[PDB]
Amino acid sequence: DIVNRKVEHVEIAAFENVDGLSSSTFLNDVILVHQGFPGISFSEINTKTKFFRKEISVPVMVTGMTGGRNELGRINKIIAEVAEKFGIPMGVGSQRVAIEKAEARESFAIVRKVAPTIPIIANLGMPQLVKGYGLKEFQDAIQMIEADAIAVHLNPAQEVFQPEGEPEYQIYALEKLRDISKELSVPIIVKESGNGISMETAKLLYSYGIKNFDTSGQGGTNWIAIEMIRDIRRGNWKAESAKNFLDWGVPTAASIMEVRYSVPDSFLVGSGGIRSGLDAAKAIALGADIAGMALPVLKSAIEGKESLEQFFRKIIFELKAAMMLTGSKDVDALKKTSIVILGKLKEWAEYRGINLSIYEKVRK
Amino acid sequence: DIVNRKVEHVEIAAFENVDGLSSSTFLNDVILVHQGFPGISFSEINTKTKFFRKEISVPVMVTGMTGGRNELGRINKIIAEVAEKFGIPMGVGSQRVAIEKAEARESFAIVRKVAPTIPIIANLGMPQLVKGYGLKEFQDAIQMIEADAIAVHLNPAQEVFQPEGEPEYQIYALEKLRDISKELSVPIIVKESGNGISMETAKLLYSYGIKNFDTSGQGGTNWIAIEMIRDIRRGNWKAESAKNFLDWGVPTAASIMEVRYSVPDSFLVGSGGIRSGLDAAKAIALGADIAGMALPVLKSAIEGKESLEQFFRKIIFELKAAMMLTGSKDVDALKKTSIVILGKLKEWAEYRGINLSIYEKVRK
Amino acid sequence: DIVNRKVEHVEIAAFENVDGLSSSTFLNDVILVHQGFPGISFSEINTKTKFFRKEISVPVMVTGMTGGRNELGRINKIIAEVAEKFGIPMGVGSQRVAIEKAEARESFAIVRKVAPTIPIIANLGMPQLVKGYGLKEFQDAIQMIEADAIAVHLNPAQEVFQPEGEPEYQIYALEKLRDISKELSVPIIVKESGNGISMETAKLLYSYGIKNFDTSGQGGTNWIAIEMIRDIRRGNWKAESAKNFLDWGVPTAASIMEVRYSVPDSFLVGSGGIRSGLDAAKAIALGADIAGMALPVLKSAIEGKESLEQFFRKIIFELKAAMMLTGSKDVDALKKTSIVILGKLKEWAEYRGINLSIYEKVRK
Amino acid sequence: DIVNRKVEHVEIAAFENVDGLSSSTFLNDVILVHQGFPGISFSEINTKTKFFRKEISVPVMVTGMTGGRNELGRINKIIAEVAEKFGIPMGVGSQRVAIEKAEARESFAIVRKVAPTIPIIANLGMPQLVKGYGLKEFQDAIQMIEADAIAVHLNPAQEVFQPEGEPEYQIYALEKLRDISKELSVPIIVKESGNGISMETAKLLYSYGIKNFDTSGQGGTNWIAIEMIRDIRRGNWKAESAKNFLDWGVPTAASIMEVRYSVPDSFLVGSGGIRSGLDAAKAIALGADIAGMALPVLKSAIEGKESLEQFFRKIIFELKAAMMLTGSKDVDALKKTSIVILGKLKEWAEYRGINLSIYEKVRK
Numbered sequence A, B, C, D: 001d002i003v004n005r006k007v008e009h010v011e012i013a014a015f016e017n018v019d020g021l022s023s024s025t026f027l028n029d030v031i032l033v034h035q036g037f038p039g040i041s042f043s044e045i046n047t048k049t050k051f052f053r054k055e056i057s058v059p060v061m062v063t064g065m066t067g068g069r070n071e072l073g074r075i076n077k078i079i080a081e082v083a084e085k086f087g088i089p090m091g092v093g094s095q096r097v098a099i100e101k102a103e104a105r106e107s108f109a110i111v112r113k114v115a116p117t118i119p120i121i122a123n124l125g126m127p128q129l130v131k132g133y134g135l136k137e138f139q140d141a142i143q144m145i146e147a148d149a150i151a152v153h154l155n156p157a158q159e160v161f162q163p164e165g166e167p168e169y170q171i172y173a174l175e176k177l178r179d180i181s182k183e184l185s186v187p188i189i190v191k192e193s194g195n196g197i198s199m200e201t202a203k204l205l206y207s208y209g210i211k212n213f214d215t216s217g218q219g220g221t222n223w224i225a226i227e228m229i230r231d232i233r234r235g236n237w238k239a240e241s242a243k244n245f246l247d248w249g250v251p252t253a254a255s256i257m258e259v260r261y262s263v264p265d266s267f268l269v270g271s272g273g274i275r276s277g278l279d280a281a282k283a284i285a286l287g288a289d290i291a292g293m294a295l296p297v298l299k300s301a302i303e304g305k306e307s308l309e310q311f312f313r314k315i316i317f318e319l320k321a322a323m324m325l326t327g328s329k330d331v332d333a334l335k336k337t338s339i340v341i342l343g344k345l346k347e348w349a350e351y352r353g354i355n356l357s358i359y360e361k362v363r364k
């Protein structure tokens, strides 16, 4: 029955209108400065970068989405085999459903069978830490796919509007997560799920030892929309309230700025509405180490292996065109390339006390 | 005949297009910062707060609207009994009509019969203070409903365009109000009626002893539109002039800032176009002690008791979602939560000498 | 034939779409701060003010438009008799046509027959000063209507696009104007004609003794558009060029700021797209001494005396509404009332070095 | 092969929708301040200016476009003979095609036969410098048309999306350019091609001795769009990627500021979406020495000699109208005339560290 949410989630995400619904990444307020003399040739552009103890071919990852039933595993299988082929890391979807039901397990393990070398990232929700999950459940999530890291997701907005949601985010959870991390052999990433990570939340997680963040800002998949749709579907009164919250959250671009600023040494995934290699380039230039994507990977995967391969080919070409046209021979140069910040993003940073001088120095 | 006006007011506000007509709250310029780790659980959120010497369940009030005839009293009955059920304060409409006609009295008194515990707020207009009302009339308004406070409304814009209107706001009235307040056993609130309270107005009222304010800013019920409609209806020439004034006034959000800034210890109702618990959260976060609402309460009340009950359930849920998602365990924490101010509201504050640093400290 | 262009000007201005065509006054960036406690009564509001040596009932004037043929004089007759009834000053149209043709004279003189007490303002164009006009022609313009002042118009944008235009604006014209002003027994006002007065132009005129200005900024009657239509009509190639210039000039609001700032002691008419008594209030609050209007007066005058009477009644009502609602018992108080400046006007002032503190003090 | 590309470029530029496609010059953020007293007469305005060792009649040039086949030469012939008649300089299109194929030569030489006195500017692409071209090729391009200068184009964005493009911009190319310039008897201009010159690029070029720049900013011909169209036509996958890059580049107005700022003594052509004499005047007032145009000259030339004569007549009239209306007797006075800069261009300059005070002094 958690298993039908799982398919309903994928079905609404894949086929309903929830991508950027009434929301914004603020990435239109970021401009990469064009260099008419790049100083490089396209063919010498190098996109390799570090992902924990592995090297990856591109600074992009697929973030966690699904798992829990065999048709969901077939999607994970297509994503994982193509991610392997391209040398990109892949997070799986929440593994709760496979801690609760042994028959859900293969729909996650298939990822590692088909992708033996790339970084694979486990996944469990914060609310499960408040309800009993502890070290052993983390280790089971991890071994089930021989993960190189585990992502713990924050989705309080989703849970608030979810018909059968669990909006429990007591501080005790962080004490538990900090303890669990002492004992785990792989790092923890804390990621949002469409509503973004602010500086208050990043400093707080940081105070409990978390150094790896995934912004998942607003502007991309709108989980408040997804749950609004599930509410409409059951005639649940919450739907009209969800609609008032459609634009709730920290935009992706602002979240990247807030996390890089407030935790200058964090390992940062910039995600939530990254739809092109140009978006990916902007995310990294603003301050992320890697760009994350979920929804468009799902939509291509459902179309098939070849559609997904073409999708990555296009993302990668678009990333390298942005590096070419900013004179960035490598990911490190991209992180330092010249930008312009305009509009609401600029007003957001100013109000929030993001001194642009210190900002430029910190993103580099 | 003032009784026909009372009827025509309700009918135009309920059924014509005057909610936010050519006007704006500026609340879209206020963003509540999302906290992906709230640090609390939904179920522990506490919405109680003080309203003078009483405790109320939710920091929201229904502000004054109607009374004067038995159908108007049936509306007041429904609002009051639901307000009583939910532990929320209720203002009644202008009681002038019941000072002038004894047969109008029961349409107000019904409120206290059906709501014996909640704060009830009496109502008289400023222009009646310059025309002979004094202490006794205030006391009669109060005792008629065993009121816990009396609201004196400012409606000069309305009066100017009213067919019918009395635009008399001589300073003598304030002298009289200050004198009356010496003798009254309950507090006075001064409220606008759709065009908002500016800093010069709030400082002037304060200089005469007024400490309780209700912004009633523009962007909600447009009273200049309502009178425009009454002018059209009678082929009165003033209609075309009212139309040029549709966007006149201080936007709610700016008014909240101006009042809180210029009278930092004021008790503040933030109202005028509050249409969701999210709007209510923003109002409180910006500087108000409570959020006030009138028009959407009227619309639900007209549909009936159950519709009105559902409306409050939804407002309260939305308020709590916004507290949850900012990590606000209680009203006091919401007042201090992180915000961003952008766009025209930012420009309005800057031009008016609202130093944002000092604003932050003052709102807390 | 000059007589024909005068006919054609009125016809295009009255009947074609040239009011505010692709242009803006920037008055939407000026907000008058609402005072919910005005401290006054509508009936005590005083709108009297000084116009040179006379008193006028309202701080509004009708600016120069027409004259030159008998049907044009019938329009001047109607405007003048209504202006007399209301105690408002009236400028006449360029009197060149009546210096050149004695039969054109009565169409100006009728103004003074019918309006024996109000200020009447004569009119000649700056280009004529470089083409032979001097003292005697000014004195002839003045005595023809026993004028209390003479306006000299600037219209270089119009003359550039006019099929038979004279774009001659040699500095010698100012030397001549300065000399003439020594000898004249009435004051000179220099007025633009839909393209506005900048600070450089105001300071230059001031250096030659000019102390009285009429901004005639962009956003109201678009004279470039008028000449563009005349060019289309004659298949003149210039029409396409005029179209690129439709939005050329200083917006009225900016021009009022520029002139009041750069010449703090000037006598200032704020005009160019004043369409309501609210616009008129904003213009005075921004820095003008009086609001000027031309096109809407022509349109009403063409419809008849009673239409024109109704029009002034509405402007006056709207002006007094705005004074009531800002707590302005008189014109002097309106000049000092609180405002907000936002948007492009704000950015215009900042780029042009208009320090807002010193601005606030100067407008007063 | 390349001859076919040359024909398809002209056809797509002339007849498809690529002029300003999803892009912007930012010239709408530049306002020339109107001067109601210009202090000059239209007939005394002088538009002459220097272009290296020649005098040209108007501060406008036609920038390089075509050549390579006899129908392309017939367009070159028409533009050249009209340019000659008007005293305006003309660049030819890339001469690569005529270095590779001797039959393409006459389509360039024709320009000098028909325009013996005006400056003619040769053209080669920067990629060819890394691919074997050097002094001799430059000298051939120059003698082929007895050029007064040679433009070297930057088009890395075009090359990236061009189906058969060569994105090779190694620093060695600049080393070679600098060496060539020692030996050449005419100056070098470095020009972009629709995507604009940033300060980092201008400083880098300057460091290798280049002092002559042509902004060719985004907002006019969109070469990324043109190549997108060629990719669509060939079902080449890159088209979808080009589409994501449609708004890539430095807007013309921003590029003019960046170059004039970071290289104050540069000789500077402002181009990329100059469509009227008004645009031309803005470009010069902002900091360019001359305004450049390509696409609208092509579309006129294709209609014929008389159409192109009419086009120039219009551009020059518009330019002079803008001088007239700013009080600019000559090109030098235009470069110093008062402007306002607003909106995104203002935010762009602030973010990029362009101090407006120092900007003003340098643009003069």
Ligand SMILES: Cc1cc2c(cc1C)N(C[C@H](O)[C@H](O)[C@H](O)COP(=O)(O)O)c1[nH]c(=O)[nH]c(=O)c1N2
Binding pocket: A009, A010, A013, A014, A063, A064, A065, A066, A092, A093, A094, A095, A123, A151, A152, A153, A191, A192, A193, A194, A216, A217, A219, A220, A221, A271, A272, A273, A274, A292, A293, A294, A295, A296, A298
């Ligand atoms: C269908 C599907 C389902 C999930 C997701 C999304 C998608 C589309 N996402 C959130 C996802 O990883 C990502 O953070 C957000 O979707 C923002 O990225 P995009 O805008 O989708 O690129 C998500 N995140 C998570 O941490 N655990 C989960 O199980 C899921 N589930």
Ligand SMILES: Cc1cc2c(cc1C)N(C[C@H](O)[C@H](O)[C@H](O)COP(=O)(O)O)c1[nH]c(=O)[nH]c(=O)c1N2
Binding pocket: B009, B010, B013, B014, B063, B064, B065, B066, B092, B093, B094, B123, B151, B152, B153, B191, B192, B193, B194, B216, B217, B219, B220, B221, B271, B272, B273, B274, B292, B293, B294, B295, B296, B298
């Ligand atoms: C039908 C009706 C009639 C009244 C009002 C409202 C409406 C809708 N309001 C104004 C109300 O108290 C509130 O200040 C404004 O309407 C702004 O709130 P809303 O935007 O309507 O939530 C009101 N104000 C008051 O002080 N005395 C009054 O009698 C009236 N009457």
Ligand SMILES: Cc1cc2c(cc1C)N(C[C@H](O)[C@H](O)[C@H](O)COP(=O)(O)O)c1[nH]c(=O)[nH]c(=O)c1N2
Binding pocket: C009, C010, C013, C014, C063, C064, C065, C066, C092, C093, C094, C095, C123, C151, C152, C153, C154, C191, C192, C193, C194, C216, C217, C219, C220, C221, C271, C272, C273, C274, C292, C293, C294, C295, C296, C298
């Ligand atoms: C039909 C007509 C004819 C003229 C004008 C206007 C109109 C509408 N105006 C310009 C006028 O006085 C005013 O400066 C502008 O029209 C801007 O004000 P409005 O936007 O029209 O209110 C004008 N100005 C002036 O100095 N002498 C002239 O003779 C003319 N004639």
Ligand SMILES: Cc1cc2c(cc1C)N(C[C@H](O)[C@H](O)[C@H](O)COP(=O)(O)O)c1[nH]c(=O)[nH]c(=O)c1N2
Binding pocket: D009, D010, D013, D063, D064, D065, D066, D092, D093, D094, D123, D151, D152, D153, D191, D192, D193, D194, D216, D217, D219, D220, D221, D271, D272, D273, D274, D292, D293, D294, D295, D296, D298
């Ligand atoms: C048909 C065509 C062909 C060419 C171009 C343009 C056009 C439209 N342009 C670029 C051009 O010179 C100019 O920099 C840009 O087109 C921007 O100016 P416009 O917006 O077209 O005025 C160009 N530039 C150049 O240096 N060498 C050339 O071969 C070409 N070819």
Ligand code: DMA
Binding pocket: A002, A005, A006, A094, A095, A096, A097, A124, A125, A153, A154, A155, A158, A193, A223
């Ligand atoms: C976007 C995201 C985190 C989806 C998981 O939602 P959920 O609450 O259904 O996950 P779980 O299965 O962990 O409860």
Ligand code: DMA
Binding pocket: B002, B005, B094, B095, B096, B097, B124, B125, B153, B154, B155, B158, B193, B223
């Ligand atoms: C919004 C508002 C204050 C309505 C009451 O106006 P009114 O002038 O009809 O009230 P009263 O009956 O007190 O004159």
Ligand code: DMA
Binding pocket: C002, C005, C094, C095, C096, C097, C124, C125, C153, C154, C155, C158, C193, C223
């Ligand atoms: C708007 C305005 C000033 C019109 C008079 O133009 P004009 O050039 O025809 O006047 P004159 O008859 O004085 O040339």
Ligand code: DMA
Binding pocket: D002, D005, D006, D094, D095, D096, D097, D124, D125, D153, D154, D155, D158, D193, D223
């Ligand atoms: C806009 C511009 C510079 C066009 C020349 O393009 P190209 O790559 O076809 O030129 P070349 O013939 O020099 O390769």
Ligand SMILES: [Mg+2]
Binding pocket: A125, A127, A166
């Ligand atoms: Mg969950």
Ligand SMILES: [Mg+2]
Binding pocket: B125, B127, B155, B159, B166
């Ligand atoms: Mg009243």
Ligand SMILES: [Mg+2]
Binding pocket: C125, C127, C159, C166
């Ligand atoms: Mg004239």
Ligand SMILES: [Mg+2]
Binding pocket: D125, D127, D159, D166
């Ligand atoms: Mg090339």
